[PDB]
Design a protein around this ligand. Structure first.
Ligand SMILES: Nc1nc2c(ncn2[C@@H]2O[C@@H]3COP(=O)(O)O[C@H]3[C@H]2O)c(=O)[nH]1
Ligand SMILES: [Mg+2]
Ligand SMILES: [Mn+2]
Length: 328
């Protein structure tokens, strides 16, 4: 309803409102628009207010985080924007502010933004098997994730980027610990371990028990990370071709360098459909089923799109298969 046009990085009222929901079209926007969005999130969640974040530093820091993501097909700035924007969505969808402190929100949000810093676009198995410098550096223990985390704090140690410069040190120590746990929790090698620890607490969940809360925070960041398929089908789908783009780059290389190839990155055997049916049925549906025991509104906003996406890929596979029966 506006009297004149604004530049793009002046988000409109429509965009700001849309940003609260997981229907948001994470493809519409260029990096500067995404930066303004992340910025708005910090103000709107009251984090600028409650941690005295100098607002120019907030901007400088985000631009700096941006600079430290690489131009990978999948593990890129736009992916961290998805993860952060889904977390933002979740704060509203689950009323996380009723249950969590502002320090906990700061952790969730900053860990979402930082959780894949400087990802080289080849996973931990490649690093370990190739004996990369990262694998040697981190002794084969969640090397990518430990690195993302280290880069996060290197950025924050530069004073012009230090969004925590006005938090007292006890606060800093606490945010740092949370963020480390959360970013490390994103390594999928630990998925069943973390899911088991959570389910065990979920036998008698207790919002006043820090250990219960830490596990909830780890499940929350894990949901957000692997949440592409929760989004509308037109927004979700292009991500799968990016993921395969990386997975196939890795397996080419592995083949070429004599290293073990994983069959789920095997060009000859893998399909969008075959990639997503299992990942939806046996990773995403069940994780969100348990979150849903705490947050039942999660069913309708997030389990439904997943059921729909599983059903669609199942159809797709039926036709892809028909189609390779014209071949070979
Ligand atoms: N098959 C499939 N795997 C995914 C999908 N989304 C995330 N993953 C995997 O989950 C991993 C989680 O952390 P990263 O974001 O470091 O790398 C991710 C992918 O390997 C998806 O939509 N489909
Ligand atoms: Mg990761
Ligand atoms: Mn990620």
């Amino acid at each position: 309803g506006s009297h004149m046009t604004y530049p793009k990085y002046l988000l409109s009222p429509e965009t700001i409102e849309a940003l609260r929901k997981p229907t948001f079209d994470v493809w519409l926007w260029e990096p500067n628009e995404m930066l303004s969005c992340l910025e708005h999130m910090y103000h709107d969640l009251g984090l600028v207010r409650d941690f005295s974040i100098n607002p120019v530093t907030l901007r400088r820091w985000l631009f700096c985080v941006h600079d430290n993501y690489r131009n990978n097909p999948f593990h890129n700035f736009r992916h961290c924007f998805c993860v952060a924007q889904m977390m933002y969505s979740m704060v509203w969808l689950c009323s996380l502010q009723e249950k969590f402190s502002q320090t906990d929100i700061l952790i969730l949000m900053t860990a979402a933004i930082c959780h894949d810093l400087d990802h080289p676009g080849y996973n931990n198995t490649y690093q370990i098997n190739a004996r990369t410098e990262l694998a040697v550096r981190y002794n084969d223990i969640s090397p990518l994730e430990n690195h993302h985390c280290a880069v996060a704090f290197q950025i924050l140690a530069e004073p012009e980027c230090n969004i925590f410069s006005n938090i007292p040190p006890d606060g800093f120590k606490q945010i740092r610990q949370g963020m480390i746990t959360l970013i490390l929790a994103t390594d999928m090698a630990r998925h069943a371990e973390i899911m088991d620890s959570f389910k065990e607490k979920m036998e008698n969940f207790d919002y006043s028990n820090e250990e219960h809360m830490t596990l909830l925070k780890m499940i929350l960041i894990k949901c957000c990370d692997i949440s592409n398929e929760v989004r509308p089908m037109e927004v979700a789908e292009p991500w799968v071709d990016c993921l395969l783009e990386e997975y196939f780059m890795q397996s080419d290389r592995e083949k070429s360098e004599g290293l073990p190839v994983a069959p789920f990155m095997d060009r000859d055997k893998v399909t969008k459909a075959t990639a997503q049916i299992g990942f939806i049925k046996f990773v995403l549906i069940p994780m969100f089923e348990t979150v849903t025991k705490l947050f039942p509104m999660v069913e309708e906003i997030m389990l439904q799109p997943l059921w729909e996406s599983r059903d669609r890929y199942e159809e797709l596979k039926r036709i892809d298969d028909a189609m390779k029966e014209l071949q070979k």
